[PDB]
Design a protein around this ligand. Structure first.
Ligand code: GDP
Ligand code: A1IMC
Ligand code: MG
Length: 169
């Protein structure tokens, strides 16, 4: 059994909680209190390995937060989520990456870029632009829908794979 500590970050409203609850509890939440921050543990099998996922669904995204610094220290991989209909949330991604890099004092940070709400038809962020951003960071890019469950397991499992690989570098 191997443990993987995953942290879900992104602007308020992008779907951090809805993604996390979909993965863990297999249901979509319509109106989840934006202040609730918890961790969830679940065992899954990924590439033949029985993995214990320990996932923190973050609430506040404050720059100045001792607790955020501690969880970025403890977290091994980061799911950086924006919503495909919220350009500001996409622009916020750089700031979250910078924060994480600073806390780690490293460029070796396992991260996956997630464009959530792929079920919404009025896109404001071109998939091309998001692919380009992820390429510039050297990270995977996945579009998900918490509402339909599209690529929910793939996003989290892709982050596990990124961590597993960095452990060999
Ligand atoms: N249509 C759609 N709505 C979503 C999706 N993910 C989350 N939402 C909705 O967007 C709002 C914010 O989601 P929440 O998970 O609470 O965002 P958080 O603040 O990032 O935790 C809620 O009303 C959710 O039901 C999605 O994939 N598609
Ligand atoms: O520091 S942990 O060991 N556990 C935590 N558990 C919680 C619960 C509520 C709020 C916060 Cl800030 C936390 S941090 C942890 C960090 C990163 C990823 C998974 C974790 O369990
Ligand atoms: Mg939330």
């Amino acid at each position: 059994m191997t443990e993987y500590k995953l942290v879900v970050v992104g602007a308020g409203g992008v779907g951090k909680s809805a993604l996390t609850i979909q993965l863990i509890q297999n249901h979509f939440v319509d109106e989840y209190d934006p202040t609730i921050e918890d961790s969830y543990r679940k065992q899954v099998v990924i590439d033949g390995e029985t993995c214990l996922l320990d996932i923190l669904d973050t609430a506040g995204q404050e720059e100045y937060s001792a607790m955020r610094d501690q969880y970025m220290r403890t977290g091994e991989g980061f799911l950086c989520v924006f919503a495909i209909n919220n350009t500001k949330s996409f622009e916020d991604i750089h700031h979250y990456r910078e924060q994480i890099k600073r806390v780690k004092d490293s460029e070796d940070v396992p991260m996956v870029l997630v464009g959530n709400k792929s079920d919404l038809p009025s896109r404001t962020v071109d998939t091309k632009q998001a692919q380009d951003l992820a390429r510039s960071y050297g990270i995977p890019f996945i579009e998900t829908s918490a509402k339909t469950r599209q690529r929910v397991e793939d996003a989290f499992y892709t982050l596990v794979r990124e961590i597993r690989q960095y452990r060999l570098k």
